[model samples]
Structures are given as structure tokens and as C-alpha cells.
Target: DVLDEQLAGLAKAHPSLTLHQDPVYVTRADAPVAGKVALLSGGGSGHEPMHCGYIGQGMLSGACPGEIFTSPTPDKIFECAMQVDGGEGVLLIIKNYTGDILNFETATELLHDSGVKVTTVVIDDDVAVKDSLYTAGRRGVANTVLIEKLVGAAAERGDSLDACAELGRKLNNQGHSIGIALGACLADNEMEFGVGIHGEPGIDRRPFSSLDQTVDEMFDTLLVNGSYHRTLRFWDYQQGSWQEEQQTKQPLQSGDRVIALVNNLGATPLSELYGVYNRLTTRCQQAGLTIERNLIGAYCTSLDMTGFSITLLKVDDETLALWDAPVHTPALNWGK
Candidate 1:
């Protein structure tokens, strides 16, 4: 009821979109055409301007936002899939949380049973979690925002479901994220490392003295050579159930052309974000990373948390071309 009221106001303002109260989701008014593959992504509600903000002509076809920090039910996910199933097919871009994984996969099975060809790409890019043994396996952080844009553009251009899903998987593998919290919601000398978006404390907390030193520490962490191994779950179309696959993540290195995002967690002013980006650019150059493109602002944020995260996506020409593609969403828009 609360979310519906808020979405109603938004739908009224943006006539190009509509809010479906029955399933409790939002979609582009003209989505699910015969030839294009539709893109759908959703999670907890508080991450506004994310699942919803990224919906439009060249982004998501539909968004299902659950209660604050809670995963949406299977019915919501299933209905959202039906609402945005362009004749080509539908792709579900899901975050990596246990509840979300279970619900979205269940919905995937339901959709397939109904004869709606569907596929899913699970995002789990946070490098902070040591392994799946500790936390929910590297909570899908800011890279989700980037993945939607890249894959959304592909879908809009009439790419096949398999192609778009492949691109999404590649983006997830190439991207890496790390966050530092300066206390709960303010700048303090003590900082927490590897924090989650729901105001959860990171793996460790330490002192924060200078901005340069802080940025360097993050850069070194991203550049450190190491392997991240985890077991991931995905829906099997043929098997008609969920299956697990072990995966590995490699660290970033020199001479990589990349798209960098310096995201504000919540309450940091733009002036300070620029300060972070200023140092971030130099750090990338020093480390032999060519910054082909960059996005700096609050796209993915925790409520009132005074902190930021850095995401680097190693890109090739194909990836760079997609990154440069036009997209028109509420939070992220360029070349529209």
C-alpha cells in the first residue's frame, strides 16, 4: 500500500510509465514488443532510482521493488516477468542475496512452466566478502547499476536473450567493488571496511586519516592479485530446477581499459565525491589502467550512510561500444 501510493505519484508524472497495483510493480508503457528481448531487475525497495530509476525505453522493461531491504515474493517476480515479456524473451537481472536468489529462481521456474522462455543473470560483484562461507557471497553492490545499462542497451538494439545474458555475465565477471564507511552516516576518523548497503558493518573497521591514503588503500585492494571462488545458483531450462556451479573471480591489473564508477553511498556531498574521483583518476593512471569512461554520483546508495564505493569494469572494444551506447533512465541518462 505504501509503495503503491509512491509509485502512483511517479506514474502520474511520467506518463511513459505505468504502475501495476495487482502484482505491485512498474513497467514502461510500451514494453514487450514482438522483436525485442525485455530486461527486468528488482530487489529491496530502499535502493530507489535503482530498479525503478533504471526503467525506460533503453533500460529495464519492468521493476519489482520489495519492502525496505526485503526481497519481493515469487508472485511479484512472476507477474513482472509476464508484464514485460517481449516476444523475443525476458531476462532477469538479479542481485545475489539468499532470499532474492530463491524467490527469483522460483519465479523463473514458474515462468518457464508457463511457456515463456526466460533466463537469469545473477550479480555478485562485491569483493569485500572473503568467500561465500562468511556472508551471502559478495553482496551485489554498485555494479548492478552498470550491468543494467549495458545489457539494457543491448536489448533495446534487439539482441537475442542469449547474447544479452552472456554480456551480463561478462560484465559481472569483469567488475569489482569495495566500500568504506566513515562511521554510520558522517565523516569520522574511524572507518569500517567491506560494508553492506543495509547499514551492516564491514569485515573490519580502522582509522581514516587522509583522503589520499584512503583512496590508495582501496586502489591497492582492487589491484591485489588473488582468486575469489564461490558456488553460484542458476535456473536450468532443460532440468526445470535450480543448479549450482562453482566460479572464480580474478583481480584487476595494469594496462586494462576500464569504465570506473565512484558511487556515493548516501549522504556525501558532491564536492567530496569529486575529491574522491580526482584522486581516483590519478590512481588509475598510476596503476596503468586507462579510464575509457566514468560515472560519479549516487546511483546505488544505502540510506543516509556517509560513505562511497568504487567499481572498475575491465572493458574491450565491444564492451566500450556498449558502454557508449545511448540510454535514457531516471538516474542514468546520456546520448538519449
Candidate 2:
């Protein structure tokens, strides 16, 4: 009932969007670009303006929003996949969580049985505690927005299902993020370091510190712990089965060019977030990294969490070009 009410006027507000009942999901009302692979992503609903808010050109083609903090069911996911899929096929961008993984896996199977050419890429960009309570590896956090924008651009430009999946996976490896919560939304503590978006505890709890030190800690952690090793599952379109491959994230180092994102987790003041961003730019410069572009806002948020996160996505010329592509969505729109 709450989820229904939350999405009630969404389609009405944005004519470009079409909301579906029954299983409950959102899709683009307009036709997708010809021969373009449809990009789909979803998770719990409380993380406002994430999957659902990102459906349109150069972003998600469709989004399945579950109840607050709950993963969407396979039925809704499968239906949403069918809704936005063009002739080129569908690419699922799944976060690395237990329920999300299992549910999207079931949806992948359902789509496969229906003879849809579909593939999936799982994102685990958080540099918090590994193998946490919610995920087998690092939790997928703020960098999801970066992946959606970059990969969606690739899909809009007529990439095939395999090509799109490859691009998404590459971006996943190139990105990293870490979140910190202040005293407001968290427990009595003044601060919690390395938190998950779902209100989960951070890796450590500490007293509120200066803005520069907090950003410096998060940035240093991202640089040091950027390279993580884990075996990931991939949907084999041809073999008709799921397969696993060991994957590793690239370490963030000096002389690398990147897109920096200073995200507001929930109720963080925009003024304070810019404080975080300003310190971030200084850190990047001190580290000998080039800030190619920066996006600062509450793009992926834990509702009312009152904290912030920093995401660094290493970029190359091709990836930077994709980052420059046009995007038209309710929450994210840019270019002509």
C-alpha cells in the first residue's frame, strides 16, 4: 500500500514514464532507441530517486522498486525486463546483495526460458566491511549512479547485449565508494564510519570529526582498499546457465583520471556536502589524480540517514566520452 502510494503520481508527473501496476514497476513511456540494448536496474524503494528516478534516455530503461528496504520479487523484475527490452536485448545491473542476487537470478532464468537475450552485471563498489551482513562481498552503494549513467550511455549508442554487459562490468570494476553517517539519523553516536545504505552499521563507530579528516579517511580507504578479489556470477546467454568467474577491482593510484561523486546519503545539508566536495578536490590533487568530472547530490540515498558518501570512478578517454553523452531522466538530465 505504501509503495503503491509512493509511486501513484510518478507517471502522471513525468509523461516520459509509464508506471505499471500488478507486480509494480516503471518503464519509459516512449519507445527506446532502435537496436539499442535496454538497461534495467532496481532495488528497495526507500533509496529514493535511484532506480525508478533514473528511468529514461541515457539511464535505466526500466526499474522495479520493492517495498522500502526490501528487494523486488522476480515476477516484477521479469515483467519490467519484458517491458523495456528492445530487439537488441536487456542488460540487468544488479547490486551485490543476497536477496537482490537471488531475486534477479530467478528473473534471469525466467527471461531465459522465454527466449529473451538477456545478461547481467553485479556491482559491489562499497569499500566498507567485506562479506557483510547483507552481501557476500562488499555492498553495492553510491557508485551505482555512476554505472547507470555511464553504461546507459553505452546502451543508448546501439551497443549489443554482450557489448553492453561488458561495458557495465568494466565500469563496475573501475568504481569505488564509501559512506559515513552522522549522529542525526544513526544511533546516539556522533558518527558511524563505513555504513551501508540500508541503515546497517558502519565498519566502525567514532566521534564526529572535522570535515577534512573524515573525507581524508574515506578517500584514503578507497585508494588503499580499492582492489578487492571475489568470484562473480554471470548469466551465460548461450550456455543457458549461470557461471562464476573470479574478478578483481583495479586499485586507485596517482596519475589516474576519474569522475568524483560526493553523495548525500539522506538528510545531509547541501552546504555540508559541498564542504565534503571541496576537501575531496584538495585530496585528489594531493594524490596526483585528475578530476575529469564531478557530480554532487543525493543521487543514491538511504532515506533520512543524514550522512554522505564519496565515489571515485577511474575513467579513460572512451569512458569519459560516454560520461559526456546526453541523458534525459526525471532525476538526472544533461546535454542536448
Candidate 3:
């Protein structure tokens, strides 16, 4: 009931957003760009202003929102895909959770049967663990936003469905995420070692310390334990079936260029986040990382939990160009 009410108000407030009830989904009220592939992404609704807030020019064409911390059903996903697909086709961005994987893949098959061109790219960039309670592999974390921004930009520039899907896959492979979950803003000197967007206690709770040390430890873990290998399944629209591929996460090393995102989990103060960024800058410099660009704020959150998540996406010139492109979503809007 709360999510429904909030989404209703959000749809009313954002002129570009239109809400579809029953099997709920939100779409950009404005028509899609001519000849551009339509982009779609969503998951459990608690991460405020992510999939939904990212719906507008130069971003997602639609987002299928489920209940709080629950994956949206296939009916909602299929409906959104049909509505958003132009002659160019549609690309689905999926997180690597069991329910989301099942539902999004079902939607892709539904779209295929209905004569719509569709494909999917799965995101699994969590650096904290190889598997979790809700995921058989790494959980997709904040880096979903980066992939959406880049792929959305490509679609906006009239890229083909294949091109957009390929770009999304590459972006997913190039990012890493780890969240720091404290008991709350009220808690002291304790941290959840491996946290996801869900409220589950990460792998373990450890002693939390100074701001500099906390950020330094996260950077160290990301650089040291980041190399991951997993099997990914995605829709092969050409063959009208699914294909499996083994993907490996390339560890971030010294002298790498990156786009860093320091995201607030929920109730952390802006000043505090700025302090984290301050320490983050020094850590990157010490590790020989060149910060090419950065997004500092709560682009993704877990319903007022007390913590923060950090993401570092390895970037090339092309990726940076897409990141600099215009976007006019309710949450993240610039130069549009």
C-alpha cells in the first residue's frame, strides 16, 4: 500500500512519467526517440528513484516496479516491454537475483512470442561476495545505474538493439560495488561486511573505525578481491532462445581510470557523505587510480537504512562520453 501510494504521487509529480496499474509499471509519458532502441530496467521498489526516477529523456523508457524488496512479476515486465518497444526493439536490464532473473527472462520470451525484438543484459557487480541469500552469484548493486546511464545514452543516440545490449553487457562487466551497512545513524563502531540493497545482514558484522580507514578498507577489498567469474544467461533474440556465456570481472589495478560513485544508503547526512568522498579521493590517489568522473549522492538507497555503498566503474573514452550525455530523469538530470 505504501509503495503504491508513493508511486502514484511520483507519477503525478513527474510530468514525463505515466503509471500503469494492476500489474504495475511506469513509463515515460513522452514518445520514444525515433529509431532508437527502447530501454527497460527495474527490480524491487525500495531503492527509491532508481529504475522509476531514471525514466525520461536519455535514460530508461520504462521501469517495472515490484513491491518493496520484491521482484516485479512477468506480466508487468512484458506489458512495459510491449509499450516501450518501437520498430527498433527493446533491451531489458536485469539484476542477478533469482526472482528477477526468472521474471525478466519470462518477459523476454513473452515478447518474442508476441513478435517483438528483445534481449537482456544482466548486472552482477557486487564485490563483497560471490553468492548471497537472494543471489546465486554476485548481487547487482549501484553499478546498475551506470549501465543504465550509458546504455540509455547509446539508445538515445539511435543505436541498434544489438548495440545497446552489447554496450550494457560491457558496462556491467566493468563495475564493482560494496555497501557499508551500519546498524543505523545511531549505531557506533560496527559495520555489515557484505551488504546488498536488501535489508539482510551482509556476510558479517565487523568493527567500524575512522572514516579514512573505512574507505581505505573498502578500496582495498575492491582492488584485491574483485576478480570474479560467473556464468550469465541472456536472450538471443536472433535465435529466439537463450544463450549462456562465462563472464569474468577484471580486477581494478593501479593506474586505472574510473568513475567513482559514493552513494548514501539512506539517512546519512550530506556533510558526512562529503567527508567520505574526501577520504575516497585520497585513497584513490594513493592506489594510483585516476578519478575521471564521479557521482556523489543517494542515486540508489535501501529504504532509509543507515549506511552507504561505493561503486567504481572502469571507464574508457567512449564510456566517459556516454556518461557526459544529457539525462532528464526525476532523480538524475543534467545538461538536458
Model 1 scores a C-alpha lDDT of: 0.83
Q: Whose lDDT is higher: candidate 2's or candidate 3's?
A: 2
lDDT of 3 by residue, 1-336 (tens): 778789889988998898988778999997554578999998988898788989988899999998878899999999998888877999999988988999999989999999999999999988887778888888988999988999999999888899999888888888998888885422467888768888655767888877777788787888887787788998998899999989877898888899999999897788888998898889889889899998888888898888888899999999899999999899888994
Q: What TM-score do all the candidates reach, one by one?
A: 0.94, 0.97, 0.97
Off by over 4 Å in 1: 131-135, 185-188
What lDDT score goes with residue 254 in model 3? 86
Model 1 worst lDDT run, 10 consecutive residues: 128-137
Per candidate, the number of residue pairs that clash is 0, 0, 0
Per-residue lDDT tens digits for candidate 1, residues 178-297, read 888885743358888878777666767878888878888877777873247777776666677777878777778888898999989888788888888889899999889999999999
Number of the top TM-score candidate: 2
lDDT score, residue 315, model 3?
Answer: 91
Global lDDT scores for all candidate models: 0.83, 0.89, 0.87
Off by over 4 Å in 3: 184-188
Worst-scoring 10-residue span by lDDT in model 2: 183-192
Worst 10 residues of 3 by lDDT: 180-189
Residue 228 lDDT in candidate 2? 84
> Model 3 scores what on Cα lDDT?
0.87
